[PDB]
């Protein structure tokens, strides 16, 4: 019934912007860290009503112990990098490994997300991202929190993965 999703990735790749676009249908330039721990949205996916619970980690995410808590909480994870930020892409494998270690489980439902597809000066090619995703055996989705391209697709794909195991 309820799916706990956690969006992960480097500082400034668009984690909050993607979540807010999914929940509020608006693009933000900025946001305040909030007392609320998550946003919840009812959606219908493949004919079934589902509740998406997406953690709002802004602020407290800087603490590793808190990230450990978020990872234990999450059922599925969006691995987000920014297509104009090579380092954010190169760090994806570290984040993936950390999640697997914390959850004490190989193969945790994940989707690779390349965000900011609307911006110029792409430094990560689509084929690069697809190759990485293929190596993990997970879907790759290009997104823009600004234009909303791929946003619903990214989160719904993640839900479909989680649904196969819980
Ligand atoms: N043009 C564009 N800007 C974005 C996109 N996603 C996020 N941003 C901007 O990038 C900055 C960092 O986004 P933010 O959500 O705070 O990154 P976070 O640290 O990963 O949560 C903000 O100024 C956003 O407005 C996108 O898809 N396109
Ligand atoms: C904008 C900088 S910050 O200090 O406020 N937040 C940083 C903290 C470190 N960081 C990551 O560890 C990125 N990966 C990641 C994010 C989250 I939220 C969770 Cl739950 C797990 C991971 O890695 C497993 C980037 C932003
Ligand atoms: Mg944020």
Q: In what order do the strands lie in the sheet with 2-9?
A: 38-45, 48-55, 2-9, 76-82, 110-115, 140-142
**E strand intervals along the chain:** 2-9, 38-45, 48-55, 76-82, 110-115, 140-142
Residue from 9, 61, 94, 103 whose mutation best tests the ligand 2 pocket (most atoms within 8 A of CB):
61
Q: How many helices (H) and strands (E) does the chain have?
A: 6, 6
Q: Which residues surround ligand 3, an ion (CB under 5 A)?
A: 15-16, 58
Report which of 148, 142, 150 is spatially closest to residue 125, judged by C-alpha positions. 142
3-state secondary structure of 163: helix
Give the count of beta carbons closer than 10 Å to the beta carbon of residue 112.
24
d(CA 56, CA 53): 10
Q: Which residues contact 16 (CB under 8 A, 6 or more apart)?
A: 28, 31, 56, 58
Stated length of the chain? 166
Q: Whose CA is nearest to atom 2 of ligand 1?
A: 116
The sign of the CA dihedral 91, 92, 98, 101 is: negative
CATH label of the domain that carries residue 81:
3.40.50.300
d(CA 51, CA 72): 19
Q: Which residues pair with 45 in a beta bridge?
A: 48
Q: Which residues line ligand 2 (CB under 6 A)?
A: 6, 8-11, 57, 61-62, 67, 70-71, 95, 98-99
The CA angle 109-162-116, to the nearest 5 degrees, is: 60
| Structure tokens that stand for 159 in this block | 């839900």
Which ligand has its closest atom nearest to the C-alpha of 9? Answer: 2
d(CA 76, CA 147): 24
d(CA 121, CA 85): 9
Number of structural domains, the chain? Answer: 1
Note whether 53 and 75 are within 8 A (CB): no
**Domain limits at 136?**
1-166
Interaxial angle between packed helices 15-24 and 151-163, expressed in degrees from 0 to 180 and rounded to the nearest 10: 90
Å from CA of 7 to ligand 2 middle: 9
CA atoms within 13 A on the CB side of 100: 12
Identify the burial level of 118 via C-beta atoms within 10 angstroms of its C-beta, where 0-12 means exposed, 13-18 middle and 19 or more buried. middle
């Amino acid at each position: 019934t309820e799916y706990k999703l956690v969006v992960v990735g480097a500082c400034g790749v668009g984690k909050s912007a993607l979540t807010i676009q999914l929940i509020q249908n608006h693009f933000v330039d900025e946001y305040d860290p909030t007392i609320e721990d998550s946003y919840r949205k009812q959606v219908v996916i493949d004919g079934e009503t589902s509740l998406l619970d997406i953690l709002d980690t802004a602020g407290q995410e800087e603490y590793s112990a808190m990230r450990d808590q978020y990872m234990r909480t999450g059922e599925g994870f969006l691995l987000v990098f920014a297509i104009n930020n090579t380092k954010s892409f190169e760090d994806i494998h570290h984040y993936r490994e950390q999640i697997k270690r914390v959850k004490d489980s190989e193969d945790v439902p994940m989707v690779l997300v390349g965000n900011k597809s609307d911006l110029p000066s792409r430094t990560v090619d689509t084929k690069q991202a697809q190759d990485l995703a293929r190596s993990y055996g997970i879907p790759f989705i290009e997104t823009s929190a600004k234009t909303r391209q791929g946003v619903d697709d990214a989160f719904y794909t993640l839900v479909r993965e989680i649904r196969k195991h819980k």
